[PDB]
Amino acid sequence: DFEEIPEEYLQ
Amino acid sequence: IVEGSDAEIGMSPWQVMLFRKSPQELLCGASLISDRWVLTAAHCLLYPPWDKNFTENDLLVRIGKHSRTRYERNIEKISMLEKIYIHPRYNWRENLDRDIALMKLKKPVAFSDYIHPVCLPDRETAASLLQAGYKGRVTGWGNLKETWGQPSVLQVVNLPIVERPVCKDSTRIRITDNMFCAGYKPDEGKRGDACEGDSGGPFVMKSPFNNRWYQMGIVSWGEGCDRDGKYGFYTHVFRLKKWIQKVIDQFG
Amino acid sequence: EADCGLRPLFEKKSLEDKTERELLESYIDGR
Numbered sequence: 369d370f371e372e373i374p375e376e377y378l379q
Numbered sequence: 380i381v382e383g384s385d386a387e388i389g390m391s392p393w394q395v396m397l398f399r400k401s402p403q404e405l406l407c408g409a410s411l412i413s414d415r416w417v418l419t420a421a422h423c424l425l426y427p428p429w430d431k432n433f434t435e436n437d438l439l440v441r442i443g444k445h446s447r448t449r450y451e452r453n454i455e456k457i458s459m460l461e462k463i464y465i466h467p468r469y470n471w472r473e474n475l476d477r478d479i480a481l482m483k484l485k486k487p488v489a490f491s492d493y494i495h496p497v498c499l500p501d502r503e504t505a506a507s508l509l510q511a512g513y514k515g516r517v518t519g520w521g522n523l524k525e526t527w528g529q530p531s532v533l534q535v536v537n538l539p540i541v542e543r544p545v546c547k548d549s550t551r552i553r554i555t556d557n558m559f560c561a562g563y564k565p566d567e568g569k570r571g572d573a574c575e576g577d578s579g580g581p582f583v584m585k586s587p588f589n590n591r592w593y594q595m596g597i598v599s600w601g602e603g604c605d606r607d608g609k610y611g612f613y614t615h616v617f618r619l620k621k622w623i624q625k626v627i628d629q630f631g
Numbered sequence: 632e633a634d635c636g637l638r639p640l641f642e643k644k645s646l647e648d649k650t651e652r653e654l655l656e657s658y659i660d661g662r
């Protein structure tokens with residue numbers, strides 16, 4: 369339901 | 380937020396969304412109190428009855444948001460946590476007494492038109508404004524009703540502080556001096572409340588003395604959402620400010 | 632902190648939001 373956030377924040 | 384309205388752009392620039400990394404979902408609200416510190420409710424991070432015990436690496440904060448679900452490119456900023464601090468006398472076993480926590484960000488966030496800190500109350504501002512009938516404002520992306528559903532954008536509701544005997548008489552829980560309650564009475568012709576997902580967000584008041592917004596409360600608990608004869612309960616930020624200050628002074 | 636609680640799109644521009652007056656009207660102390 370949430371738009372994917374940029375991968376940089378999940379690293 | 381039940382029976383609120385859509386926020387205006389930049390209306391609550393201290394609003395923070397606590398966001399779970401995996402699965403990606405809303406966890407809670409929170410507020411920005413400086414370029415490096417975010418305030419929330421302890422039960423957003425630690426609540427053993429519901430098997431909740433998040434660590435720093437489980438979570439992100441999202442600051443500057445308006446839309447609930449969108450990635451707000453060039454507006455919101457996403458920060459990682461350096462460290463969580465939960466009040467050492469937070470009482471999750473009984474009544475959520477001292478329901479307060481701080482999160483230190485890994486790097487300072489840049490302020491903007493959409494990102495700006497709220498003030499914490501001094502003793503005198505708290506004494507003046509924390510009075511029955513005086514209204515504060517609650518914001519969040521939590522559910523729109525107790526049973527259902529969820530908002531497109533940040534919701535806002537203004538609610539009056541309630542006399543302490545009325546708060547106490549609305550519940551079987553032991554209320555403490557570290558809590559206050561707010562909401563309309565059944566006979567008052569207006570309604571509104573926080574709800575699931577609004578936990579940890581701010582109850583703010585605009586001082587009429589210096590025209591600044593102060594965070595008086597943290598969204599803590601309520602028996603359902605927006606039920607007649609129930610009220611929302613908020614952590615009394617001023618009463619816990621010495622602890623806030625001790626944490627920031629020691630670890631900031 | 633010196634600038635806390637003053638919103639860029641409201642207080643900093645002397646613009647009021649649509650419901651803040653409801654809060655002010657509830658504050659009796661200091662009138």
Ligand SMILES: N=C(N)NCCC[C@@H](NS(=O)(=O)Cc1ccccc1)C(=O)N1CCC[C@H]1C(=O)NCc1cc(Cl)ccc1CN
Nearest residue numbers: 422552573574575578598599600601602603604611612613
């Ligand atoms: N045990 C009691 N007799 N009273 C305390 C219940 C506190 C709990 N409420 S609850 O989750 O809706 C469950 C409930 C419902 C009706 C009666 C008893 C219990 C609650 O609010 N909790 C339990 C842990 C998380 C927090 C919460 O949901 N906070 C969000 C919140 C905050 C506010 Cl200010 C208003 C409403 C809500 C939504 N319930």
Ligand SMILES: *[C@@H]1O[C@H](CO)[C@@H](O)[C@H](O)[C@H]1NC(C)=O
Nearest residue numbers: 425426427431432433434471
């Ligand atoms: C919360 O979880 C952490 C996991 O790092 C654990 O060390 C701690 O004992 C837990 N606290 C409670 C009250 O369960």
Ligand code: NA
Nearest residue numbers: 547548550551
């Ligand atoms: Na009671």
Ligand code: NA
Nearest residue numbers: 605606607609
């Ligand atoms: Na109610």
